[PDB]
Amino acid sequence: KKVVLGKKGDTVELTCTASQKKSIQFHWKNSNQIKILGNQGSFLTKGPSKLNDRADSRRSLWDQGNFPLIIKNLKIEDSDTYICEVEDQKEEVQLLVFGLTANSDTHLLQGQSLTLTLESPPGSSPSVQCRSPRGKNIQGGKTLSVSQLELQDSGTWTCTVLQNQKKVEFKIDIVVLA
């Protein structure tokens, strides 16, 4: 499968391209084999579904043979294999959604510890690299622990997630009070 990474709360676009530069019948399904959308619109009209009202395509691109699946307001649980079927061909895309948080809602004090946690789909083992406002780089798995924060650590941290050779970047504001 092609792997695509998404950020929690963000939008992701899963591309699908046909051999011919023209519109033709297509649909997207998930790994449970539920059809999501196709040429005639969203199939999710039979009751409550996880993706209800959050999945779309770009109808204006279909006549170029491009049939993307766009999912907005991403949840970790949207992580799934999505399958685009156009005529006789099927393309499988594994979407993996991640979210980044710190273990504080308001603020930290100089000398306190920081835990950065990548909320991750079940069974994933991403690697994470973060850069502090001072320019120092740290790396590890889904959870990074910083022993003590300095006043100079107050500001925007930048963290890159690596999973299946794909990367996605998060920014998070950490405030350290004196």
Epitope: N32, P122, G123
Partner: nanobody, 121 residues
Framework: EVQLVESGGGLVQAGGSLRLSCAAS?????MGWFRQAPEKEREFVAA????????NVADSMKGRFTISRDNARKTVSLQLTNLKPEDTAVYYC?????????????????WGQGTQVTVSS
């Protein structure tokens, strides 16, 4: 209501292979395997969709562990290979994600009592 009964645990040798089974008493729901060692968190091991067409084995266990199911027999199975002392744990069968993605959620409704696997060094 669904009953899940594991079998196949026991005392095994490092480097060996072991197949665990779980008998259910359905063909419409996702099923999964988990494991828990003493004084450690329960860990996701593997999941499989209702049809068996897609599986999700934990990244750290891919290419050692595989998962399969048999809807006619109402079973799901976990194949362990190249066993390590670190694999010692109770292994739990689970079922029903309420339609959720086996790649997106591990919040299964039904749980077995588990089968103990102990890997001798």
């Amino acid at each position: 209501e669904v009953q899940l009964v594991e079998s196949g645990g026991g005392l095994v040798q490092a480097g060996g292979s072991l197949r665990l089974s779980c008998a259910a008493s359905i063909s419409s729901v996702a099923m999964g395997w988990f494991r828990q060692a003493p004084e450690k968190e329960r860990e996701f091991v593997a999941a499989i969709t209702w049809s068996g067409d897609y599986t999700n084995v934990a990244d750290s266990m891919k290419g050692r562990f595989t998962i399969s199911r048999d809807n006619a027999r109402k079973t799901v199975s976990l194949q362990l290979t190249n066993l390590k002392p670190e694999d010692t744990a109770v292994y739990y069968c689970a079922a029903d994600l309420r339609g959720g993605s086996i790649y997106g959620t591990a919040d299964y409704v039904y749980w077995g009592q588990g089968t103990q696997v102990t890997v001798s060094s």
